[PDB]
Amino acid sequence: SLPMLQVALDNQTMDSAYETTRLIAEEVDIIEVGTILCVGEGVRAVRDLKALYPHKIVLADAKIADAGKILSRMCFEANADWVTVICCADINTAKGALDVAKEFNGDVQIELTGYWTWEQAQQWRDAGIGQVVYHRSRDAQAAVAWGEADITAIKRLSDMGFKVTVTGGLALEDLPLFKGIPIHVFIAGRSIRDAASPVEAARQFKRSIAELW
Amino acid sequence: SLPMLQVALDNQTMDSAYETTRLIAEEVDIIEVGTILCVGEGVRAVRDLKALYPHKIVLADAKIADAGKILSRMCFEANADWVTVICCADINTAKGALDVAKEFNGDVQIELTGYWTWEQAQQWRDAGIGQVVYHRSRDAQAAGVAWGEADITAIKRLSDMGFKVTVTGGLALEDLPLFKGIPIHVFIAGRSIRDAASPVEAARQFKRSIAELW
């Protein structure tokens, strides 16, 4: 269907996250427990947010790097729908997290950061991974803009059969760049949370997506 | 010169962690808040363990992959001494985490796993990173992956470049002699201490073996 909209809750405490969710939870498709929230509060954040918003997809952005079975199970026992595994994890970390995900009718996304290869991407498909997150680092961005090499990479991932998420300092005005590509999800963190009107911001994203797709 | 001993608290809740620390806090050098504990309990795990053991080095194994300043600050505000940044992070993620660390009289380690390069290593040294963790994955280890000459070569090369090298990942007592003659900074044991019949004796055995081999 259309690209879904995800809000990143990169907040240090639950109450800070709820300042955002109370404005926009019904304005989005996916609620992300950001890595910062995972580290701030632990998996209770996942459990609490799914209990509040059981009708939304809850993504635990844990960036699992090792111990795939243990960490995925902790997230899925807390009622996560989706979890993230970082691309530099061993392939068996990804496989282990996926095996657990399937027990809970959930899913695993590979977070694509810095160096990764097309040979790895094929490893992920062969393993039954069907989601990747094309994830521009904020620390790179604080220093890196979007460009054709990103678009080229995103199309190639999509062609390989991944459902592709696009994220990393995304702004409303960025959306037209990805026109024509079957983007699975766009994530907005700061550009929703920190807007003068978070509700207006989310609605602008959904409006633009509807228009472009 | 003796390699130090670090216990990894890869426990899901604080009370499970404390079943281990109440036995071995004074039998090891470094208390690691494992990644699994960080995700289970959040950064309160760091604050609480440092409050219990303020004389010990407390390492938060957060495996920071992005937002290096924000995540490091959270750990350091929680009274961490050291924090980990994964090697596939942007170099500015590591730099940002180091800048914060320096505000708090702390330090950052790069976790070395999977693919990385000697160019990266020079980058880390150039940024002022003085510690790396030679970090074997338990999921590869579960697939049957063992310590060999490639590991020794790499560890000696990282040491020569000026890093203090930590060795970890399913470390067993019988693995130590493989590293004899290398100036290892720290050996981490998680499961081989926590899950022993006597965690105290397991820690003590690691310490005696290290004292003999070095």
Ligand SMILES: O=P(O)(O)OC[C@H](O)[C@@H](O)[C@H](O)CO
């Ligand atoms: O739009 P933002 O603020 O960059 O947030 C979305 C990012 O995907 C963020 O969640 C990232 O995963 C931080 O590491």
Ligand SMILES: O=P(O)(O)OC[C@H](O)[C@@H](O)[C@H](O)CO
């Ligand atoms: O000795 P173990 O059980 O392998 O634990 C130590 C590891 O370094 C562990 O903490 C690793 O970081 C988990 O990702």
Ligand SMILES: [Mg+2]
């Ligand atoms: Mg995120």
Ligand SMILES: [Mg+2]
């Ligand atoms: Mg660890």
